[PDB]
Write a structure and sequence with these properties.
Number of strands of chain A: 0
Radius of gyration of chain A: 14 Å
Order of helices and strands of chain C: HHHEHHHEEEEEE
Chains: A mainly alpha, B alpha/beta, C alpha+beta
Organism (chain B): Homo sapiens (Human)
Distance between the termini of chain A: 27 Å
Order of helices and strands of chain A: HHH
Largest interface: B-C, 25 and 25 residues
GO molecular function, one term (chain B): histone binding
CATH topology of one domain in chain C: mini-chromosome maintenance (MCM) complex, chain A, domain 1
Catalytic activity (chain B): ATP + H2O = ADP + phosphate + H(+)
Distance between the termini of chain C: 35 Å
EC number (chain B): 3.6.4.12
Family (chain B): Belongs to the MCM family.
Structural class of chain A: mainly alpha
Strand order of the largest sheet of chain C: 5-4-6
Oligomer: part of a larger assembly
Chain lengths: 58, 653, 187
């Protein structure tokens, strides 16, 4: 069989790669990443707003 | 040498200390500089070598997304402790520029590489001792800068004992050599003062301040010392929101270690890379907001969409709210002349009868914008304005700044302007004529840029305002400052039984909506509201809060309206109709200020509807605004000769 | 001294014997937050310590400057039994909740070492400034690195180096990535 690709599930697949970069170099010796100040770091090359509904599907 | 995740009991500043794993890391970054593989496959890093040697710009930049995508196992080992990884990498760049360009060795070496676009940005308040010696990207507005300073870095001393002159020495603020362990195998002899054997090194210090956009009422600002070494010199200007990356390193003094017991304990930031931002903020916005603003702009009622949202606390005075929205854009300061730089800012001067709450209309525009300040009259003077002496601690000279320089490309709010001193009103004309100040102190001149829109609130002389007198004489202000604004729309409150039923009805409706107990079921509880929207005077729904935030950071930095040549000659002969009619009853004629200002409001309304060029529908609604403000500066008796005659011009759309 | 060591062994058992509301200790929920290296909360209630011991808490407030290094090593050992912690970050005792308040005009000459509370209000505000606590120097005579350098209230310099031949009787060199600082405010 072949393979398909939508548009709503491929965003969260590549977002996990750009998400571990703001949690590894900060939680080891500085503050702990939360769910408030991290909205700026995840709003760069994505140009899409991230809230709480996207967390329930992950 | 291959695997780097197995430190074997070592720390971060120990595994990359020897030359073991360095063999593979150095050979990987060296071959990648000449072999650049981007999207389509264009080697652009090879051409950048020949571009940095033309103007002797030793600042090789590189994108962080390129090094993080090719090596997924190296995107974390770099932001660890890059204090020693970038210093050793500078020697690798010298082996590349000299291998292909042998003529570059004639100039000085030690090329400091750069790095831009960092995935992390920290504010200037959350940094303490946990971020010590960490390359963190921190932005902020520049308060002041320093020019050339002859830093004592190497002083020659003539000695005679073994035919060896003493030197070079170390006396800079970075590191020094304390007496007791001389680098020349611990030797010392006679000294002799010279006069031409002293080679100084460039050294400048920059003041960093917080951005006024996140400053609330009831907070104290903080300062930050920024130390910049060589290479990156004169790269920033005072009063400009830029971006400078550096290492949060402590301060190592050398002047108080001979008398005091504790040295200067301070945390500064060194220089590594600069980035002058304005134009890059609109390119990094979201995508879902661009689609929703185009669906609402298709209607022909978007003009009154923002006029009904200005100050939703006091009802009435519709003509006042129209001038506040147009002054938020500030126009587009261009160069219409051929050698003279004509300013292009919309300056509005408000002055009403004390009793109608004139200062509450200004407290709303400062919260819906991105940069706005607020000052009084007796709280500042000629000193705390734009620039004013030295640093009397160890013989130093450092100029400072005021409040108009840091408020670049923003909206300034000045309260209590009529009670200002006479020596202060005659010194503010320099800042509101060229948007720049030439500080000529200590023989060092430096020009900057300060885009501001003066918004003041004056009061009549003594008691209340009297409409029987002219506006130029009713307020205790000079005459050269009046001919520098544009919108002079003033109002006079009086007892009117035909309209007093909406004032008492709107203040009691907003008293419950703006109550902290009512916000528990509205702001706290999502999906519920006690009172809906207030009945406006146009039947258009107002705007909440998030609409005005993403409105000025998009339309102002996207479409640039040009200057066409439509029926502009019709205004030429129309101006002559009022020029030879004003003195026929008793009024001053219209000067050339109302002619060159028509382009300001023409491009302001075209930016709302997103027009690439000016249209005739924008120049018509701009004449009714400049005429309604000029008639309020004369006598009420001559209003029947100007309004009835020019009734065809005050009725458009 | 053996007097300061006795006030630390009995204080370690206070965090497990004296309960709070139910059958849980208020310090149990605080231990889960100390694992994250950005928050160091060590609130100790004085009105609850007197319920378990009174003569033991007398020497704590009477002589507090001497038992200062003993409180840092006792709380670090107790939290070690809860969960293993790294050996690269210290703590600080946050003793609060004092029912006794002293007046600014009520002071003599032996007020040092007394853990009290002062009232009043602050007007002037100064920015933060670091402080050399745990540093590392380097002898410029024999080229030897000396670790574990604690700075009290003066310029504590190693008078005797590692080599028992000569020493550096002048100045040293401040380390870079091997020096922990603690910022403070001089309000």
């Amino acid at each position: 069989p072949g393979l398909v690709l939508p548009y709503k599930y491929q965003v969260l697949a590549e977002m996990f790669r750009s998400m571990d970069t703001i949690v590894g170099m900060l939680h080891n010796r500085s503050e702990t990443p939360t769910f408030a100040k991290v909205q700026r770091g995840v709003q760069d090359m994505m140009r899409r707003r991230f809230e709480e509904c996207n967390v329930g599907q992950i | 040498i291959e695997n780097l995740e197995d430190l074997k009991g070592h720390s971060v500043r120990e595994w990359v200390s020897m030359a073991g794993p360095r063999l593979e890391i150095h050979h990987r970054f060296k071959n990648f500089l000449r072999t650049h593989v981007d999207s389509h496959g264009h080697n652009v890093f090879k051409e950048r070598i020949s571009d940095m040697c033309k103007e002797n710009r030793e600042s090789l930049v590189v994108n962080y997304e390129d090094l993080a995508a090719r090596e997924h196992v190296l995107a974390y080992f770099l932001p660890e402790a890059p204090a020693e990884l970038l210093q050793i990498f500078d020697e690798a760049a010298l082996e590349v520029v000299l291998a292909m360009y042998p003529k570059y060795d004639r100039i000085t070496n030690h090329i400091h590489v750069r790095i831009s676009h960092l995935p992390l940005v920290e504010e200037l308040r959350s940094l303490r001792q946990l971020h010590l010696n960490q390359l963190i990207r921190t932005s902020g507005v520049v308060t002041s800068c320093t020019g050339v300073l002859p830093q004592l870095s190497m002083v020659k001393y003539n000695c005679n004992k073994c035919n060896f002159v003493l030197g070079p020495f170390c006396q800079s603020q970075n590191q020094e050599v304390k007496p007791g362990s001389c680098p020349e195998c611990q030797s010392a002899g006679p000294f002799e003062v010279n006069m031409e054997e002293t080679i100084y090194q460039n050294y400048q210090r920059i003041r960093i301040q917080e951005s006024p956009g996140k400053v609330a009422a009831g907070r104290l600002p903080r300062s930050k010392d920024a130390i910049l070494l060589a290479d990156l010199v004169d790269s920033c200007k005072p009063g400009d929101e830029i971006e400078l990356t550096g290492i949060y390193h402590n301060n190592y003094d050398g002047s108080l270690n001979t008398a005091n017991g504790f040295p200067v304990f301070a945390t500064v930031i060194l220089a590594n890379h600069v980035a002058k931002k304005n134009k890059v903020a609109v390119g990094e916005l979201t995508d879902e907001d661009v689609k929703m603003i185009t669906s609402l702009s298709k209607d022909q009622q978007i003009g009154e969409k923002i006029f009904a949202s200005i100050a939703p606390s006091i009802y009435g005075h519709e003509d006042i709210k129209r001038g506040l929205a147009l002054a938020l854009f500030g126009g587009e300061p261009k160069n219409p002349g051929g050698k003279h730089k004509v300013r292009g800012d919309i300056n509005v001067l408000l002055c009403g009868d004390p009793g109608t709450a004139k200062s509450q209309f200004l407290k709303y525009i400062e919260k819906v914008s991105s940069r706005a300040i607020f000052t009084t009259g007796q709280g500042a003077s000629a000193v705390g304005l734009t620039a004013y002496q030295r640093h009397p601690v160890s013989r130093e000279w450092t100029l400072e700044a005021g409040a108009l320089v840091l408020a670049d490309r923003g909206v300034c709010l000045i309260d209590e302007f009529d009670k200002m001193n006479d020596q202060d009103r005659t010194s503010i004309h320099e800042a509101m004529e060229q948007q720049s100040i030439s500080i000529s102190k200590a023989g060092i001149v430096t020009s900057l840029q300060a885009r501001c829109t003066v918004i003041a609130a004056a009061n009549p002389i003594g008691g209340r305002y009297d409409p029987s007198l002219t506006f130029s004489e009713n307020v205790d202000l000079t005459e050269p400052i009046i001919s520098r604004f544009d919108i002079l729309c003033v109002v006079r409150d009086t007892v009117d039984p035909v309209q007093d039923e909406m004032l008492a009805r709107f203040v009691v409706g907003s008293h419950v909506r703006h109550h902290p107990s009512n916000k528990e079921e509205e702001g706290l509880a999502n999906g519920s509201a006690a009172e809906p929207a207030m009945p406006n005077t146009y039947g258009v729904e107002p705007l909440p809060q998030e609409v005005l935030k993403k409105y000025i950071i998009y339309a102002k930095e996207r479409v640039h309206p040009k200057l066409n040549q439509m029926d502009q000659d019709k205004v030429a002969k129309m101006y002559s109709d009022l020029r030879k009619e004003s003195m026929a009853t008793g009024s001053i004629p219209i000067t050339v200020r109302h002619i060159e200002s028509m382009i300001r409001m023409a491009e302001a309304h075209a930016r709302i509807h997103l027009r690439d060029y000016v249209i005739e529908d924008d120049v018509n609604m701009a004449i009714r605004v400049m005429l309604e403000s000029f008639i309020d500066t004369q006598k009420f008796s001559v209003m029947r000769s100007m309004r009835k005659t020019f009734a065809r011009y005050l009725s458009f759309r | 001294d053996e007097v300061a060591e006795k006030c630390q062994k009995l204080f370690l058992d206070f965090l497990e014997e004296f309960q709070s509301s139910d059958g849980e200790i208020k310090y149990l929920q605080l231990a889960e937050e100390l694992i994250r290296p950005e928050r160091n909360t060590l609130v100790v209630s004085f009105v609850d310590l007197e319920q378990f011991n009174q003569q033991l808490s007398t020497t704590i407030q009477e002589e507090f400057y001497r038992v200062y290094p003993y409180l840092c090593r006792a709380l670090k050992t107790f939290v070690k039994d809860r969960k293993e912690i790294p050996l690269a970050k210290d703590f600080y005792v946050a003793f609060q909740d004092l029912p006794t308040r002293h007046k600014i005009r009520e002071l003599t000459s032996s007020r040092i070492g007394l853990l009290t509370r002062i009232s009043g209000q602050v007007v002037r505000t100064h920015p933060v400034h670091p402080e050399l606590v745990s540093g590392t120097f380097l002898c410029l005579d024999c080229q030897t690195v000396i670790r574990d350098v604690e700075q009290q209230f003066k310029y504590t310099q190693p008078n005797i180096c590692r080599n028992p031949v000569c020493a550096n009787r002048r100045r040293f060199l401040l380390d870079t990535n091997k020096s922990r600082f603690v910022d403070f405010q001089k309000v």
